[PDB]
């Protein structure tokens with residue numbers, strides 16, 4: 001058996017999902033095993049050039065084991081590139097859903113027309129060389145056995161290693177547009193813009209944008225629509241400026257807001273986080289049409305099962321549905337908590353936990369201040385991370 005390092009890149013669509021589905025595709029093979037995944041890296045797109053093609057790349061690399069021949073492996077990867085949505089050998093390096101390259105086969109040297117290994121550009125690209133050295137820290141290029149590649153990596157110059165990861169548990173950074181987060185001054189509503197930046201640098205894989213206030217004791221449709229829409233437009237104005245383009249969750253309770261925002265921005269939206277049951281039938285219809293993830297909140301087992309039925313009854317895939325215990329919505333928390341793993345199994349849906357700053361789930365007195373809320377969220381976020389909760393929804397990372 002031969003160990004391969006496969007380079008993965010993408011700069012279009014839901015980037016981290018495209019990487020996850022590629023990895024998942026390789027692991028699905030019975031003649032391949034994943035040994036290790038590398039970190040996530042961010043880099044300016046390397047072109048060779050219409051302005052619109054420069055949208056940052058997400059790169060990593062995975063070390064696999066396999067008894068596949070190098071030419072056989074390439075066939076599989078090309079197949080994997082197509083299932084995901086890679087175009088008909090489109091123009092010379094335009095936006096790509098996925099790109100899977102064989103970087104290295106230990107010490108193999110394969111120089112042919114179809115395949116050359118190591119990849120011919122491996123040592124000129126930090127977005128390829130950096131993830132590889134991460135997985136194989138003692139690796140030398142078989143035709144430059146002298147070259148210290150760590151120094152070579154230095155000549156290639158800064159490449160940003162992201163705190164986003166390929167873990168099983170992903171963080172949902174909260175982005176609140178309501179009054180609660182209002183600080184804006186004479187010539188700048190930058191508050192929400194810097195908040196996103198910080199969610200992103202700090203490692204959030206998903207952002208959850210909600211316009212309606214959190215505090216128990218409304219706002220109108222076009223009003224809530226106007227807040228979400230202005231930010232979503234701002235977000236599109238930055239797509240190419242983000243070191244990392246996060247998956248976006250629209251958190252709304254109104255069918256008419258969903259309808260409106262999805263008609264406009266469905267292309268950049270991943271999931272709908274609906275806090276109330278409301279028009280479930282109609283909501284399922286819309287989300288079925290736009291093929292989005294949707295989240296079922298307990299606003300437990302049977303209540304959620306009931307709702308799941310309608311959704312399936314309306315045309316969405318079970319895999320597109322998460323349930324959420326619904327912490328903060330009515331001790332009793334800590335036992336559902338301690339048993340989320342059990343619930344997930346019965347239900348047959350992935351789990352979403354939003355324990356952020358809810359003093360009960362955490363087990364602190366209601367009195368607790370901001371830092372005390374934060375540190376407790378953070379420490380409990382680690383418990384869930386090791387318990388592989390699928391999404392954890394938090395104010396700070």
Ligand SMILES: Nc1ncnc2c1ncn2[C@@H]1O[C@H](COP(=O)(O)CP(=O)(O)OP(=O)(O)O)[C@@H](O)[C@H]1O
Nearest residue numbers: 074093099100101102103114115116117118119121
């Ligand atoms: N190590 C490697 N990994 C993947 N393809 C390789 C390869 N070495 C040579 N090739 C070849 O190059 C071909 C084109 O693949 P593409 O993905 O379209 C080019 P690209 O990846 O966009 O450019 P790049 O390789 O400079 O990054 C393959 O069909 C394949 O036969």
Ligand SMILES: Nc1nc2c(c(=O)[nH]1)N=C(CO)CN2
Nearest residue numbers: 009043044045046057093127
């Ligand atoms: N930053 C970055 N630039 C690229 C990449 C890539 O993966 N990352 N891949 C290319 C062709 O495959 C071309 N340019």
Ligand SMILES: Nc1nc2c(c(=O)[nH]1)N=C(CO)CN2
Nearest residue numbers: 214273297324326327328354
């Ligand atoms: N899924 C989910 N969504 C939310 C939650 C929550 O706990 N779970 N809490 C909110 C405000 O406290 C707002 N939205």
Ligand SMILES: [Mg+2]
Nearest residue numbers: 009099100101
């Ligand atoms: Mg490539």
Ligand SMILES: [Mg+2]
Nearest residue numbers: 099100101102
């Ligand atoms: Mg390629």
